[PDB]
Design a binder for this molecule. Structure first.
Ligand SMILES: Nc1ncnc2c1ncn2[C@@H]1O[C@H](COP(=O)(O)OP(=O)(O)O)[C@@H](OP(=O)(O)OP(=O)(O)O)[C@H]1O
Ligand SMILES: [Mg+2]
Ligand SMILES: [Mg+2]
Ligand SMILES: [Mg+2]
Ligand SMILES: [Mg+2]
Lengths: 496, 496, 496, 496
């Protein structure tokens, strides 16, 4: 998921729209924009689909005001395609809306506590609504009006004490302004920017990645610190505060591997440079451990791995060639009566340049291996194109554990690397050779760009969950949400 | 506006849809249906347009559950075409949704009190949202769970003490059931019905008119009494209570004149029979006061006045003839560039049977006269068809005051009868003769069908407002809402 | 179906739209408008649904020009809801478009001749496309340019020699103007009008009924004569010609019974006056043959029969009362899985005023009886409302044969009156008494308004087909078209 | 534009849809699919937008049959976004549909001849409709039925004698089969394929590029020869014929520079290999003529030029870096009243990685330079990102003349290179250095992959038009089409 918040001095609807379009890679299932208009009323538009589909002209005239937030959704457990999208809002106290990228590992406990202690009903299975109501709950304790910046930060600190997990948040409070905060482990990305209009008026904005600042012409200020809260008033004043105890920087490693855009700077690390480094480490590991193998060419599985594969081919002194081409437009397969629905995917997504594989030992480079069924089909494509020996290299280490911090991933039993050594995986997907990035090499590659980062969020690779509340009972709660997600999507399909 | 609530034992989405389609005459601007599904979650669909336009197949699969309410909107001050429609809902306490037909005369005072005392933000200008939050406010005072029927009735009584005006309401409370109540003056119509499925399970429903019960096969029980509250639990148990002090039955007279359907029974009065009576009284007044006039034929302005005109023609011993035909489908006029937009309305709505007017002194019968510009154009049509003397009779008395109890009407300065005697109106609209129903005759005609009714709501005719809080300052508040309503509709038109 | 053609001197898009809206009662399945723009290019918009749904703003800007035709479709065999709508057009010779109300009884033979002799492919099962191509064929024989009025009339005469059946047509020929013609039996309605703009420029139009002329402010000239052709040039000149031998006036009787609007004048006969006369004749027949029966009240099945029942009640000296109310809005029934829909199919269209039936012997009046399942269910409603004896009277004679002249009707085996006497029908539908208009009385009632009309098209009542080419082979051709139409409609819902 | 034709033995709707999605890069303005169903009837769906927007489920059930063609449109003169899209069809003779990629340079003369000699009206400004009608004309000369393969080839040969320009075409003839042909200069790309189902049944298809064959699993046979015609019968038989005299292979050079996909093989030339060769030639020219310049890094303007810049960086022994990232999703800019849009038009498409430009002399590589305003703004981005000296290299030679063979380009007066030397252009766009590919080097690079190709279509670079009918009169005809196209597009937004 991706989030945007613009506290400006002129209409922000188009800017939020433009900022979401450059974060569209963080989620293409749904989109939502909400603004505070001249009467201090939320104005909202959200629906399923791409940003360019969700917001028509008639919806943009509705989104009046100089302050607003936006959200694009990646389908996760609890926030399915058939579900209501973000942002949510409650009308008491004062009026609050919130957009969220991440996941709360104690969502179930929080929902119970909200109902019993506050009689606050949660109408969806999205943990973002829960986070919103916790925050609204803590804000309701203050009776005097208006709230002071210290009240709002106090409410944010109380929230960080109650909730566990990973979250980058932006929110608005009618009559006050815009806030943004980050989990105490700094897992999910969030950056702050500004744009000076004159010596009196300055606009601010936050976003999941710096590219959203670049595209609008905002000067980059800094990443929002772990546990830090940003508050920008309706007049245009910026306040900050540390709202967590023992904050630490444990940025998500997956952001650098493939999820974030290469032209972004997350916690002072160029995603592009990090990915080039990954290819250096992986190319070095390959030259060391596959010295005896005959590799004719290095070919990337586009698009994420093109720069990584270029560096590997350099380390190995081997040619780089564009053997696979990814179609920019995919298109849907229709549920067809009296027509065969036996087509296998991946042929839509990718195509093979037949001349680049014929009678060659090829080294394919992909960003990661999850289920392996996709990887199998890519290797099959190479063989059908004429490749003899087909070797596969993964920019990421083996993916053995589910992510519970905002990155949608299948359960452990669906991960091919779960409970298997490398050779088993190789034999299953049909490769002649298979190699994975060493986790220490991946850490070094990203850590090289910012040595201040001591540890990263590596749960999917090593099973170490930094929040320390991931047990089998919690994993079962998520599999329940996924069961209900499938039933809601299925019922929509029948009705169409 | 019209409302429906069905507390059933099997899915209610289609029933609510079908019930709204037979109440569509109470408002064609927007529609909304909301249900409580098997997970005790509100499921909602609302938008602008007709019932048959708003609810597609994909929206009806979303509306799962055995309990729900529906609403169709007539555009009023505060609830414009460009606005968010009903029903609204809040997620605290417990979860409440409400649909409303009427108007709160102290909406401004209530909005202030809600913000200061409860920090409850009202995001729209609809008084229905205000009514919802007052009710939610009183429900939040109870901390123990679950609420008892006496808690809910206590909250309704507290609400009736705070709010003033006219309202028929239906609402749901997650985890409890469905409630419905009526203003202490019984101004807005509301009836209760049931449908027995077996000796253990009975379904209940409420609606603005009895035709909604008829069309679904529900047995009519009774009108909801003035100030009375109905409560139906999730198990299927019915409770009632008087929730107002000094309740009285002052049913709206306009419902009988034209707004309600003729096959409905409102407060034990057949709307059809009431309208026939109106023609008897008006035919008697005409024979008395226009003895010397030469009337060739009685012609109704369809559709409401066909039965009224039939009775007048009978009293006068004169022929009845269908001189005007109303087109069932109207269609829109497009804002056209390089095309003349000088067309006058009424020709779309009505057409004249040329042979029924030629060389005749015609007595036209309409249900009421409001602005008079429409009436002028109807008289003009008759003359263009060949009529010599054109006389006009109004089933309703002169309309001199605005309605503030839920019937959308223009301000007093826009009412032709405001500050004018009959002959002035006649001279302005271009009639050779003009006559109005005497208010006492109208009361007798409706009161004849149920002599228990001592007084009716007659504010638009005599300026007597039964709630006793209609001053010039309140009339100014409504003209502000209408100013903002026009600006919102205008901005939508520009953007299309 | 209904048709409109406007040969004007200023944009006609809105005029055609407005004229179709008052002809919408002739078909609500699809609508189409096509104009000739300033570059002599057809500009088209057609789709399924009502006029008000089909034509958005974006389509009306496309419909530029001062000449155009329109069509609204009633679902028939070969042109189902799932099919391509009217108007059709071919781009050779010159460019021709046509709209048509009626039916060709030799459609199969014509399609064959078109394929073998002219290699003209007919892409749909609509007989209108065939009619367009026959006319286009005859127009291609003339080689010199431009065509002269006599050329076009010659082509129309040649077409009338080839095609058999009933048809009212309007068409345009690029570079020439607009034509309109009528079948040699004058079965389908068509009227001509004009509107003077100044001493130099006059606009003309044609339409199925005179109400389309009235609503746009066109002066009625006359019905287009049987077999006559009208031609209106781009300059604004009117020419005519008799283009059939042995033209005769056998106007469709159903137009007067229920299909046309009451304020229309078809062949100088007021539909309204004709229907009152029908009620006079039937009231006279009822009093004679049911002298001994006890009738409490006369109640019409709305809407067509309200005036007919009023006249019957007058002849019988009995009260008239609105016992049935037709629901103005119907709405769709959604295909629902695992869901009981217990609304009755008769309750969809009608509702019963319970107080008007209870403990009375009622005489229901309907316009006609076709399948009888509907009549059965309406009689059932009356009994459930409290009626004791329920008698039924049909404004039309028994319907025993299918209509092949443009009025959609089921086959003879589906008509309850087919091969049955009156009393058998009575026993099947559950009436205590059943009586039909005598065909001779129906002719008298319509003939009274214009004795010049000697005979009418009465095939559905007596089986006399004036075209004399209705054999078993044509009936099988129609049941084949109905079979394929159902499979196409089924496939749309399958995929929806 | 791009075209597809599938003559199969099982439903082709999804296959055509899938093939257009991998040809979507050839035109994103409109899309169209038409099939011949079991009753030998054209079944069509076309509209504006992307393939994934144009074809819903309801349209794919309509597209029944085992034979069909498809088209995706690039906006050109005469077929603007606001215009009717391809494919077109006529219903005489027999029924013919056609899809076309290219442009007819004698369109005006052809429209005249069609009107006078054949009275065939052309309803749009698309030259494809003209091409369809010429072919239909020649097919009508044959009177006996069925047509024989030699008849159809005779009609194609006659058409090639009449029409001038560049064209790749696919078409269907009801009752016969599918045809495809290529202009006598082999300018526009077209390839043929097959797919064996069993020893009895083989499917065939044609398409603009080989990637459409690959993605569906069709074996590549060969490019359709210049002037050659392909005919595939409904039974599954392949015939061919040379249908032009003096056919020659002058393939479009732009296809290789940027327009075609890199994994395609056009006339036995890999687009990917050709582009690498272009970069080799340009890198060699740069090292020779810019020996003395200080270049820090080579940066491509994505996406077409990434591989070209990679090869340049290799020749120069300099680092390659992803300095520019192309935004995958662009989104629309809404016409906003009273609202400042301060996003820059270059920022819409591209974003700059600030760290890759700061304090470096950068060599930007783009595929071509047309207007120069874009290049100016990209150079400006580099400087704002921190670049010192910014040098620009164009993979294509200077573009001085308009393309009249199917590639949309502005007129010569809008081309910055028109009437200017290299250094003047450099001064205007703001580069510190500017260099272009030598046309002779470009020919060598493409010619290396297939020396059998002696000459290419190079009109845009050198003004040599191989058709020899590009005069000032045709250029005025095109600027007229562009004028009317703009007025139609303007009128759509006015009314939206
Ligand atoms: N001259 C013209 N220039 C530009 N665009 C034109 C056009 N003539 C037609 N179109 C468009 O192209 C489609 C034609 O298909 P039809 O609607 O007639 O038929 P269908 O295939 O059975 O659905 C339509 O778009 P749409 O995406 O189906 O959406 P709307 O039905 O909501 O409108 C129409 O808007
Ligand atoms: Mg929607
Ligand atoms: Mg919507
Ligand atoms: Mg459409
Ligand atoms: Mg459309």
């Amino acid at each position: 998921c991706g989030i945007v918040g613009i506290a400006g001095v002129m209409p922000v609807n188009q800017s939020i729209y433009d900022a979401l379009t450059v974060l569209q890679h963080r989620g293409q299932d749904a989109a939502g924009i909400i603004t505070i208009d001249a009467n201090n009323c939320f104005r909202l538009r959200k629906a399923n689909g791409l940003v360019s589909d969700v917001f028509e002209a008639r919806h943009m005239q509705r989104l009046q005001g100089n302050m607003g937030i936006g959200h694009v959704r990646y389908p996760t457990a609890g926030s399915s395609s058939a579900s209501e999208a973000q942002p949510f809002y409650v009308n008491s106290p004062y009026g609050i809306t919130l957009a969220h990228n991440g996941n709360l590992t104690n969502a179930h406990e929080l929902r119970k506590k909200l109902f019993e202690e506050k009689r606050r009903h949660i109408n969806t299975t999205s943990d973002s609504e829960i986070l919103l109501n916790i925050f609204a709950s803590e804000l309701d304790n203050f009776r005097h009006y208006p709230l002071e910046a210290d009240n709002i930060f106090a409410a944010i600190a109380a929230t960080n004490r109650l909730i566990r997990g990973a979250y980058a948040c932006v929110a608005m409070i009618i009559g006050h302004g815009m806030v943004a905060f980050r989990d105490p482990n700094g897992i999910r990305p969030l950056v702050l920017g500004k744009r000076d209009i004159d010596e009196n008026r300055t606009e601010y904005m936050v976003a999941s990645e710096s590219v959203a600042l670049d595209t609008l012409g905002f000067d980059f200020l800094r990443d929002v610190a772990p546990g830090e809260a940003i508050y920008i008033t309706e007049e245009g004043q910026l306040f900050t505060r540390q709202c967590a105890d023992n904050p630490v920087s444990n940025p998500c490693l997956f952001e650098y591997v493939y999820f974030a855009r290469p032209d972004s700077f997350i916690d002072k690390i160029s995603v592009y440079s990090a990915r080039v480094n990954m290819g250096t480490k992986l190319g070095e590991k390959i030259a060391r451990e596959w010295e005896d193998l005959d590799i004719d060419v290095v070919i990337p599985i586009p698009e994420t791995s093109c720069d990584i594969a270029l560096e590997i081919a350099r380390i190995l002194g081997k040619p780089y060639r564009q053997g696979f081409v990814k179609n920019r437009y995919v298109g849907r397969t229709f549920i067809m009566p009296g027509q065969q629905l036996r087509r296998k995917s991946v042929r839509r997504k990718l195509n093979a340049n037949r001349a680049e594989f014929r009678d060659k030992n090829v080294l394919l480079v992909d960003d990661s291996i999850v289920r392996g069924t996709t990887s199998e089909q890519i290797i099959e494509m190479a063989r059908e194109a004429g490749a003899k020996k087909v070797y596969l290299a993964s920019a990421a280490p083996e993916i053995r554990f589910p992510n519970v911090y905002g990155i949608d991933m299948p359960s452990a039993t669906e991960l091919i690397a779960h409970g298997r050594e490398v050779d088993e995986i190789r034999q299953i997907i049909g490769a002649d050779g298979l190699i994975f990035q060493d986790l220490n090499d991946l850490i070094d590659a990203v850590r090289a760009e910012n040595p201040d980062i001591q540890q990263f969020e590596c749960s999917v690779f090593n099973g170490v969950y930094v929040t320390k509340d991931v047990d089998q009972g919690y994993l079962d709660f998520l599999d329940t949400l996924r069961n209900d997600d499938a039933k809601a999507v299925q019922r929509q399909n029948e009705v169409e």
